[PDB]
Amino acid sequence: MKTPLVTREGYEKLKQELNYLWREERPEVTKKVTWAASLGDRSENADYQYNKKRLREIDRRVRYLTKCMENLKIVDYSPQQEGKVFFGAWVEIENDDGVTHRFRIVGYDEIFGRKDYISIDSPMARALLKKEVGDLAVVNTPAGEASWYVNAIEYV
Template sequence: MRYRPPQPKGSKFITPEGAERLKSELDHLWRVLRPQVTQAVQEAAAQGDRSENAEYIYGKRQLREIDRRVRFLRQRLDGMVVVDKPPSDPSRVFFGAWVKL
């Protein structure tokens, strides 16, 4: 058996289905959810005093969380390697394989 050093935390390999899920989450956050929250923050800011405006404070917090997740997803997707075809040797276990014992 060949020794393989442990992978660093957060493997860079992903299945096509996993990559599609991450891309759709990123798209939903950026194109749907973020504009909605931005609009809500603008409406809350228009009400006046922001220091005691709970809707404004909560909206800003939501925007920070969305932006943090968007940054994470973009960095993650940039470094990903999509594994879409199995290796030629079917007797070996490979990434994304279903194994029956």
């Protein structure tokens, strides 16, 4: 349920974050918690407490990111082996009443609505994983029963 593969692009980000976190926001957060204490009482002060949390949360991701950088795996792959869906592949799919929605498959670690918003350890990513330019893919979930048609695969 935890997958190491990560795009080259996505890698740059993870690095970027740890950078922004340790060099740019840790300074900001620690600085406020400072004044907070100088300013007064611990409980009634909401900013002393809020900032303590964001700093606990901040150093937390700092920890996670750091380890995922070393254990993550990059998938530098271009158009040569194409046709089949597997990774970093922008896929288009169809619904009978007309539901059309795009998506490229990339890892959960760093996915946001920015580059591609589908993780590989995901149902759709599983069904659609390796299927030709026009197969009939299925997906199941609690109330979710679903049929989809693979339209086009674009790797760029």
